[PDB]
């Protein structure tokens, strides 16, 4: 019998640990029974974010002093999903994770269950590619089981910290033979991201293993997770997994619904999401424990035929807006800003938009 | 002689992009003697540098004084432009077209939308953001009110002003006259001219008192603000250019228009509240939309309903393009359509970090 | 005998025409004679500048009441080359290029000349592929005869304005079943930037025919031009050339040199380029009357071993930062930011360096 | 008898100590008499850069286990200089200042020194205003004693950290019923910094205390400091100085000179700055260890008459501009872009100029 906790701490800057210092101190948090943090940190969320590993070194250097252990270690037992840009309204936080294990009669239904796994570093070449969808793939399913559920439908949300391509890892690449997917290190993001995706889906049973190829990548948008959640960052070379369901062998106090936006003002999958998971009145939204989704601009240039200027604005990177928007849209359904949106909806989601998924109390 | 308003939100390829109000012209539905106004949401960044509203009003004052066989100098005399830049997040570049046509028909029963202009005087850079922009903004609307044949300042439901802005050289040649600027920022001197503006309109309407308003009130006082004033700077004009909406008991038009306020930059409730108000009453009549209209800002605090953000803190990028983006956002996730007039800036506006909104519908 | 005058103009922004009236109202410029006029407009340079198509229809729109014809007319007539972003202390400016006939006496050695030719519109996916290059290249031929320069070596600069994709007109091209290039707006200025610069290239002999194609635009950094300076737009589908060099048949009291900038820090290169315009020392810059610079980033990220984040910042486009750079190296050469200064230099120059040239009385 | 050493090391990362560790293992720096570490860290060097608090842990973090100590103990130990924003080509790197005690001969000539010290914290409502200025040029004094330098005349290069306003500081001063200087966080950095740079000049003489008051800082441009170099940053509430001159009492192989640019383009105080330290040639470039610079935009919006932007656009900030176009001016004068440059030079040099320092060998 496994329990989850979930607890939103609103945070003052990238390296702000106070909130969840105020929780340990208190007892409501015991530090070793956390298992992943996802954030929302307050840089640009695109490739020169540091926000993201800031706030990443924080979180370990506190969590290696209340569980006396060292940094690197608390980085192998911890997932740290570090999501960077805070774009509109969106407030920074960060979202804890604790997996109890307690003994007592198991809430009749189903509740929350949370796995984790991490995947084996990658080499830059295989960025983007078959082997990076196998790979997460297969972590896929160890982090659901690890999570105790066994049905790939009672899973409504899969977070994944991915990997990058920086120029070292280019010609840490290139002096071997190898070419890599994409030159552009931005780029690589929408690789990764999408290639991680890709594998969500592979071990979920939402696409068939023939129709996935280095080409359909980024390119075949009919192929795609309806509850797979990836975020790119520079700090790491393997991806981290977290995966979040319902399972019946669980005494959570709190349940996990989704949906999926057709686009990026879809208010209509908001509230879908928000009925999926126990909120169907505007009064019972106090017992939101977070909101989490996905963001993107249409490859079309259009949201439900009217042109905006996303992909043609060359100050501000599109991936910026498409969070601004998309939390903004959330926050005017639910009242409050502080939710988790993240850019980038390769293979997340039909070109433009993305899964939303809600934790809430029962 | 009967008022008839018309109104046609047309979608824009590009700042310089008349095809749309060519095409209403070309088929008869506009005759371009009859138009009054053209707002327009151009995709410039809407701060100091934004040069796509001078360029989309030279295109569409050179168009249309092609069109009438005058001189573009007396299309400007008579035509309200007024091109709000910043199109952020998703929302759609469009121009909205007034018409007043003279019908020979008696007014509609009831109110129907009414549409009045007026332009102040150019303002010296001295006065900008102080109470002489108050004042004569306020006689402006005035004359504006009467204009359209609305009696009743309740009755007023949007009122849109251009105003000028301080640039190095017009703040250069106060300081040679003796005088001094209300602000020594391009930048922050687009609030104190959008914040004199909207007072103004809401001295003319009676909704705060004279003798609440001076000069050091101006951008800070916030209590005081209109309920209806929407106001945008820009580099193209040394006057004001005001335009006001309501309903009118002397109106053929077959339109109305509604208004609400946001009290912060994700309430929803105010877009619902507008939309009522101008008689749509469900989502399927949301398809009588014509336009919408609304201001946002980054409120003082730092905060939505307590919840911190980084607005005013962001270096890369400027708050009010970030407000634009939010309030569309939000307006388009109600009414399903993200092509809606949103200005950024509104100060004495609606509240701190909310501001006015306003529905055109069908009857 | 043609007799070329040039005209450095500051302006107050993109629609300021009122230098160039002031020299038409003085009798200085016969408006009827210019054949060119080349912009430093104040937009952001980069996809949605749109500073670039105010400048010219500001231009055409003066100049056709001034010689009563229609703005139609005026740009048919008149090369009109805009190129956006005035980073750093660059200032804006227009240089306006004037050819009248004369009879004189033959003029000692070769004198500035220009010629000016247009191509076709493109086809979105037309853009960076051989039929841009192949067209650019007839253009350019047809300039050099405009100019009456027979020798490529008296080609000392060949300014392009070419198009780029926005959204829209990809969209278009899918629903054709059209593939554009490449599917990033700010890329696609990259590829039609350098299959003109290419164009150039193949046409004044620089490379062989047979080494272009179209897996070679934008990847094989050593073909280039030395001459080429291109710069792309959106408020143009066509590309316009103006050819600058010197000819025997001139009567210009003006000439042209040139160098190559290795790197974006080469000041020694901007000296060469005075030398070979005749400006033999610090006391004699008084007779420039415009520098002409392409500026990029460097593939390697790096400059003399040195890393630099222009390839990396994801809120300044890296064109921007080359232009304020390279326009700041030269000021401090030349004593006066009221240099042209065009960013991504993309088979022109080496890999993060460009050609430089010097327009100079004699 | 005080010997510094300087080591300039280049950075990968914010978070990169892997060049001072090599340092260290090496047996070239003993971690314990490091005072100062002077960085210039990659993000925008604004209000919302957190590049600098995150190179500040990962460096305290380094040392406190190098030497066996806590954190806390080695930042009020060290001085931590973060200036962030490295725009255009300039290189990310450290400067670490080595300072120990010797028992050696005297030698004739002055030799390079440095002091360090720091103020008190402020109030929101003190930056920009008197207590700030009074209360550092106090710390400059001490500053000079710990660097035995006597004579006001042998400083050539005062930099400071100092602190900035956030809204929710700026909200808080409201809730406390007390006004701040400015109520915009980007322009508080330039008050903090002014006022700053104000109590160097009053500490070493430059002016006289009677023409000092609220109401001149950051209005009377008259009044600077020829050595001060003040940095803002979110990541911190009181102002830490570091002195650097020449001193009889050292033993140092350095020496340090300056010059002041008169304005951004200034390549003849760049000169004169390496005069200063000795370097009289182009073949001696190699004695250079670091060069310092301050940059910023003119308040008339002009470079010797000619217009430019950086006060206009609202899309990049001033003092990004400022810092790419003084960075690329050094590099093309000394060949090498990894050079300290930071932006807003207020009552630091004249208004449009600020100091130059050079730290060579002998
Ligand atoms: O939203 C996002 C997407 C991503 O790829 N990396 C981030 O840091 N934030
Ligand atoms: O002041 C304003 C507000 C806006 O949103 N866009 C503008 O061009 N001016
Ligand atoms: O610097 C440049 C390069 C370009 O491609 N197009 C422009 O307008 N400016
Ligand atoms: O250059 C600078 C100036 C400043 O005030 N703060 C920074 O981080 N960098
Ligand atoms: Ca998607
Ligand atoms: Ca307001
Ligand atoms: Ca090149
Ligand atoms: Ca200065």
């Known amino acids: 019998m496994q329990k989850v906790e979930v607890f939103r701490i609103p945070t003052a800057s990238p390296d702000d640990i106070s909130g969840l210092a105020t929780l340990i101190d208190s007892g409501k948090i015991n530090p070793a029974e956390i298992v992943a943090?996802?954030?929302?940190?307050?840089?640009?969320?695109?490739?020169?974010?540091?926000?993201?590993?800031?706030?990443?070194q924080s979180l370990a250097m506190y969590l290696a002093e209340k569980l006396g252990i060292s940094r690197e270690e608390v980085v192998k037992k911890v997932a740290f999903i570090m999501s960077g840009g805070t774009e509109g309204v969106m407030?920074?936080?960060?979202?804890?994770?604790?997996?109890?294990?307690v003994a007592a009669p198991a809430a009749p239904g189903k509740r929350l269950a949370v796995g984790v796994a991490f995947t084996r570093d990658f080499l830059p070449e295989e960025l983007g590619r078959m082997e990076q969808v196998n790979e997460v793939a297969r972590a896929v399913k160890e982090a659901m089981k690890d999570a105790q559920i066994?049905?790939?439908?009672?899973?409504?949300?899969?977070?994944?910290?991915?990997?990058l391509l920086t120029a070292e890892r280019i010609e840490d690449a290139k002096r071997r033979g190898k070419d890599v997917?994409?030159?552009?290190?931005?780029?690589?993001?929408?690789?990764?991201?999408?290639?991680?995706?890709?594998?969500?889906?592979?071990?979920?049973?939402?696409?068939?293993?023939?129709?996935?190829?280095?080409?359909?990548?980024?390119?075949?948008w009919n192929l795609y997770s309806s509850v797979?959640?990836?975020?790119?960052?520079?700090?790491?070379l393997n991806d981290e997994i977290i995966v979040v369901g319902n399972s019946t062998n669980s005494a959570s106090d709190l349940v996990i619904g989704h949906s999926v936006m057709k686009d990026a003002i879809d208010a209509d999958?908001?509230?879908?999401?928000?009925?999926?998971?126990?909120?169907?009145?505007?009064?019972?939204?106090?017992?939101?424990?977070?909101?989490?989704?996905?963001?993107?601009?249409?490859?079309?240039g259009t949201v439900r035929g009217r042109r905006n200027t996303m992909l043609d604005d060359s100050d501000i990177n599109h991936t910026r807006s498409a969070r601004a928007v998309v939390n903004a849209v959330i926050a005017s359904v639910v009242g409050d800003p502080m939710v988790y949106v993240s850019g980038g909806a390769e293979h997340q989601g039909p070109d433009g938009?993305?899964?939303?998924?809600?934790?809430?109390?029962?």
């Not at 940190?41 to 926000?51: I, M």
């Not at 407030?91 to 294990?101: A, M, Y």
């Not at 066994?150 to 990997?163: E, G, L, S, T």
């Not at 928000?274 to 601009?297: C, F, H, P, Q, T």
């Open 37 to 56: 943090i996802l954030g929302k940190t307050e840089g640009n969320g695109c490739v020169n974010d540091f926000t993201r590993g800031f706030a990443t």
């Open 91 to 101: 407030t920074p936080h960060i979202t804890v994770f604790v997996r109890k294990d």
């Open 150 to 163: 066994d049905d790939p439908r009672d899973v409504h949300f899969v977070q994944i910290k991915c990997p």
């Open 181 to 220: 997917v994409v030159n552009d290190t931005y780029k690589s993001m929408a690789y990764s991201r999408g290639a991680s995706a890709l594998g969500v889906a592979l071990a979920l049973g939402e696409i068939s293993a023939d129709k996935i190829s280095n080409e359909a990548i980024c390119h075949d």
């Open 228 to 236: 797979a959640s990836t975020s790119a960052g520079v700090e790491l």
């Open 269 to 300: 999958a908001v509230r879908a999401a928000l009925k999926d998971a126990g909120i169907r009145s505007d009064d019972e939204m106090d017992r939101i424990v977070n909101v989490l989704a996905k963001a993107e601009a249409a490859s079309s």
């Open 353 to 362: 938009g993305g899964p939303i998924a809600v934790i809430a109390r029962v």
